[PDB]
Design a protein around this motif. Structure first.
Motif, PDB file in Angstrom:
ATOM      1  N   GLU A   1       0.773  -1.162  -0.126  1.00 45.32           N
ATOM      2  CA  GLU A   1       0.089  -0.018  -0.174  1.00 45.32           C
ATOM      3  C   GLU A   1       0.682   1.253   0.100  1.00 45.32           C
ATOM      4  O   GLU A   1       0.553   2.340  -0.696  1.00 45.32           O
ATOM      5  N   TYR A   2       1.820   1.223   0.691  1.00 49.40           N
ATOM      6  CA  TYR A   2       3.004   2.246   0.910  1.00 49.40           C
ATOM      7  C   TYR A   2       3.666   2.441  -0.479  1.00 49.40           C
ATOM      8  O   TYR A   2       4.003   3.633  -0.901  1.00 49.40           O
ATOM      9  N   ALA A   3       4.005   1.341  -1.360  1.00 50.18           N
ATOM     10  CA  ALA A   3       4.863   1.375  -2.371  1.00 50.18           C
ATOM     11  C   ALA A   3       4.020   1.952  -3.523  1.00 50.18           C
ATOM     12  O   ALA A   3       4.513   2.262  -4.462  1.00 50.18           O
ATOM     13  N   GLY A   4       2.608   2.223  -3.156  1.00 54.13           N
ATOM     14  CA  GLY A   4       1.943   2.904  -4.484  1.00 54.13           C
ATOM     15  C   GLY A   4       2.402   4.252  -4.485  1.00 54.13           C
ATOM     16  O   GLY A   4       2.411   4.741  -5.852  1.00 54.13           O
ATOM     17  N   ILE A   5       2.696   4.784  -3.549  1.00 51.97           N
ATOM     18  CA  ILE A   5       3.069   6.568  -3.548  1.00 51.97           C
ATOM     19  C   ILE A   5       4.285   6.803  -4.705  1.00 51.97           C
ATOM     20  O   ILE A   5       3.778   7.682  -5.462  1.00 51.97           O
ATOM     21  N   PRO A   6       5.388   6.172  -4.485  1.00 50.05           N
ATOM     22  CA  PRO A   6       6.375   6.343  -5.718  1.00 50.05           C
ATOM     23  C   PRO A   6       6.041   5.924  -7.036  1.00 50.05           C
ATOM     24  O   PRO A   6       6.209   6.831  -7.874  1.00 50.05           O
ATOM     25  N   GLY A   7       5.461   4.954  -7.232  1.00 49.39           N
ATOM     26  CA  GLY A   7       5.028   4.530  -8.389  1.00 49.39           C
ATOM     27  C   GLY A   7       3.902   5.656  -9.004  1.00 49.39           C
ATOM     28  O   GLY A   7       4.246   6.290  -9.955  1.00 49.39           O
ATOM     29  N   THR A   8       2.663   5.619  -8.624  1.00 44.83           N
ATOM     30  CA  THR A   8       1.758   6.311  -8.836  1.00 44.83           C
ATOM     31  C   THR A   8       2.122   7.702  -9.279  1.00 44.83           C
ATOM     32  O   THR A   8       1.996   8.421 -10.230  1.00 44.83           O
ATOM     33  N   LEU A   9       2.886   8.321  -8.465  1.00 41.85           N
ATOM     34  CA  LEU A   9       3.867   9.806  -8.571  1.00 41.85           C
ATOM     35  C   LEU A   9       4.244   9.526  -9.971  1.00 41.85           C
ATOM     36  O   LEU A   9       4.226  10.500 -10.918  1.00 41.85           O
ATOM     37  N   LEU A  10       5.025   8.494 -10.226  1.00 39.61           N
ATOM     38  CA  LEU A  10       5.878   8.231 -11.482  1.00 39.61           C
ATOM     39  C   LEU A  10       4.930   7.971 -12.693  1.00 39.61           C
ATOM     40  O   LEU A  10       5.201   8.205 -13.749  1.00 39.61           O
ATOM     41  N   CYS A  11       3.780   7.229 -12.414  1.00 37.67           N
ATOM     42  CA  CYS A  11       2.952   6.822 -13.342  1.00 37.67           C
ATOM     43  C   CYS A  11       2.317   8.238 -13.922  1.00 37.67           C
ATOM     44  O   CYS A  11       1.967   8.117 -15.273  1.00 37.67           O
ATOM     45  N   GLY A  12       2.266   9.098 -13.087  1.00 39.59           N
ATOM     46  CA  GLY A  12       1.921  10.553 -13.778  1.00 39.59           C
ATOM     47  C   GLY A  12       2.951  11.212 -14.810  1.00 39.59           C
ATOM     48  O   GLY A  12       2.845  11.559 -15.794  1.00 39.59           O
ATOM     49  N   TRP A  13       4.103  11.263 -14.214  1.00 33.55           N
ATOM     50  CA  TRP A  13       5.172  11.837 -15.164  1.00 33.55           C
ATOM     51  C   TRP A  13       5.466  11.070 -16.217  1.00 33.55           C
ATOM     52  O   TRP A  13       5.795  11.733 -17.397  1.00 33.55           O
ATOM     53  N   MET A  14       5.657   9.571 -16.175  1.00 38.78           N
ATOM     54  CA  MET A  14       5.958   8.794 -17.137  1.00 38.78           C
ATOM     55  C   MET A  14       4.739   8.930 -18.447  1.00 38.78           C
ATOM     56  O   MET A  14       5.228   9.252 -19.432  1.00 38.78           O
ATOM     57  N   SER A  15       3.429   9.435 -17.905  1.00 36.58           N
ATOM     58  CA  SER A  15       2.536   9.482 -18.624  1.00 36.58           C
ATOM     59  C   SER A  15       2.401  10.756 -19.529  1.00 36.58           C
ATOM     60  O   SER A  15       1.960  10.738 -20.600  1.00 36.58           O
ATOM     61  N   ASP A  16       2.890  11.718 -18.954  1.00 39.78           N
ATOM     62  CA  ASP A  16       2.948  13.037 -19.552  1.00 39.78           C
ATOM     63  C   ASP A  16       4.156  13.109 -20.515  1.00 39.78           C
ATOM     64  O   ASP A  16       4.132  13.715 -21.580  1.00 39.78           O
ATOM     65  N   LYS A  17       5.409  12.784 -19.886  1.00 38.30           N
ATOM     66  CA  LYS A  17       6.423  12.623 -20.721  1.00 38.30           C
ATOM     67  C   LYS A  17       7.003  11.807 -21.747  1.00 38.30           C
ATOM     68  O   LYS A  17       7.413  12.128 -23.036  1.00 38.30           O
ATOM     69  N   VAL A  18       6.438  10.557 -21.565  1.00 36.67           N
ATOM     70  CA  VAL A  18       6.932   9.332 -22.501  1.00 36.67           C
ATOM     71  C   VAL A  18       5.735   9.112 -23.388  1.00 36.67           C
ATOM     72  O   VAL A  18       5.857   8.932 -24.627  1.00 36.67           O
TER      73      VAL A  18
END
Length: 434
Positions: A282-299
């Protein structure tokens, strides 16, 4: 009796200074206040593997857990106005402690805890109370300052379910030694929740009342339901992502609510690491989700459906490998869980965002919201109830069949919404025609 405004103006030359503090102050309030609710939902889950060594569990308990979601469901239908009337400072703690106390009702009173859906009913209140928790948190953010809010919220949706929902198995894990009883130590997390609730109350405020300054400080200064029926109701497109979100949510919760119980049914190594994973997941979702956003915008250059695809695919691959595992799952599940969780939120956020585009100007709001609820509502009932029952007359294997299968459609479906939205675009061409 409360609601109570009590506003009185003492501006006095430099209210700005007491504003900086009254804002840095309050923000933690509602954030941690809101966070505290999550210690309370997923306590029963932890109960079920402990609970029911005894023939109790049918897969029925899931129906019991099913309660929280239903009430949260019938909940927003009306509480949405109450907090509007009442004051966020009181109403938030007033709902938590009101709910977190109920949990205590279960952890201590035998009759109350072990009855086979006496719990449904007790738990059901939990859902109803859980209802109040967020909207005052909403009324507050309205009193921060317009055109800034986008930021306060960015942080609140995505961090709040995790920072709080991942801590409880940790306390139970700890409360094991001090409170020896196992079938019911689901109460210790609740014990502390009340404490946060106070802290919540002790720091929040309305902020009209001491400053008297409606948020000006920069001089921002800014139809009915029909919209859902008119713009959202057919929208064959919005439907697909919604019927899709479901299975996304079922992979998340169904895998997670069983995580402690399924571990130690089969692949039974220990309670120690079991609960230390649920936290991790549940805690490991923080970094991912956060990244899921940037990867989604940039890549992916702004294509939301496709990012879900990338993520949804990646989540599925892990879920199955982890599906294929013997009592040699020790160093596979740790990573397995860390990973599954890491990505499951990716599509939760993306669809919602996706919905905004799938309809006209105002529809976005109620369009993107409809998704969340069609998604969460059902996603859980199945995530909890159905799975349990798809294990009684079937094996436990058939559990993942619905889960792995569930994901499979989310993608195929996420594809369709992609094709459909684009086919739709080509047709504006016919607008010129006659």
């Amino acid at each position: 009796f409360k609601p109570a405004p009590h506003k009185a103006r003492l501006p006095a030359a430099e209210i700005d200074p007491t504003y900086r503090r009254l804002r840095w102050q309050i923000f933690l309030g509602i954030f941690f206040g809101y966070a505290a609710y999550y210690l309370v939902r997923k306590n029963f889950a932890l109960a079920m593997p402990y609970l029911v060594e005894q023939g109790f569990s049918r897969g029925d308990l899931g129906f019991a857990l099913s309660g929280i979601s239903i009430a949260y469901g019938f909940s927003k239908f009306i509480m949405g106005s109450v907090s509007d009337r009442s004051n966020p400072r009181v109403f938030l703690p007033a709902g938590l402690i009101l709910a977190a106390a109920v949990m205590l009702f279960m952890g201590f009173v035998p009759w109350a805890t072990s009855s086979i859906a006496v719990m449904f009913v007790l738990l059901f209140l939990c859902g109803w109370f859980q209802g109040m928790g967020w909207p005052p948190c909403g009324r507050t953010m309205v009193h921060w300052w317009s055109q800034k809010e986008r930021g306060g919220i960015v942080s609140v949706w995505n961090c709040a379910h995790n920072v709080g929902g991942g801590i409880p198995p940790l306390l139970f894990l700890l409360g094991m030694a001090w409170f020896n009883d196992w079938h019911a130590a689901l109460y210790m997390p609740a014990f502390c929740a009340i404490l946060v609730a106070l802290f919540a109350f002790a720091m929040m405020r309305d902020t009209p009342q001491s400053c008297g300054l409606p948020p000006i400080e920069e001089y921002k200064n800014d139809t009915a339901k029909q919209i859902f029926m008119q713009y959202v109701l057919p929208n064959k497109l919005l439907w697909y992502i919604a019927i899709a979100n479901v299975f996304v949510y079922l992979l998340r919760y169904g895998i997670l609510d069983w995580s402690p119980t399924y571990l130690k049914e089969v692949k039974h190594f220990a309670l120690d690491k079991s609960s230390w994973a649920y936290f991790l997941y549940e805690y490991a979702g923080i970094p991912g989700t956060l990244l899921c956003g940037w990867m989604s915008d940039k890549v992916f250059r702004g294509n939301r459906g496709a990012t879900g695809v990338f993520f949804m695919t990646l989540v599925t691959i892990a879920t199955i490998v982890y599906w294929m595992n013997p009592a040699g799952n020790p160093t596979v599940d740790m990573i397995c869980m860390i990973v599954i969780g890491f990505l499951i939120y990716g599509p939760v956020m993306l669809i919602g965002l996706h919905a905004l585009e799938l309809a006209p100007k105002k529809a976005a709001g109620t369009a993107a919201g409809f998704t969340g609820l069609f998604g969460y509502l059902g996603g859980s009932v199945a995530a909890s109830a159905i799975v349990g029952y798809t294990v009684d007359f079937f094996g436990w294997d058939g559990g993942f069949m619905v889960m792995i299968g569930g994901s499979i459609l989310a993608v195929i479906l996420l594809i369709v919404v992609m094709i459909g939205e684009k086919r739709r675009h080509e047709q504006l061409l016919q607008e010129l025609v006659p």
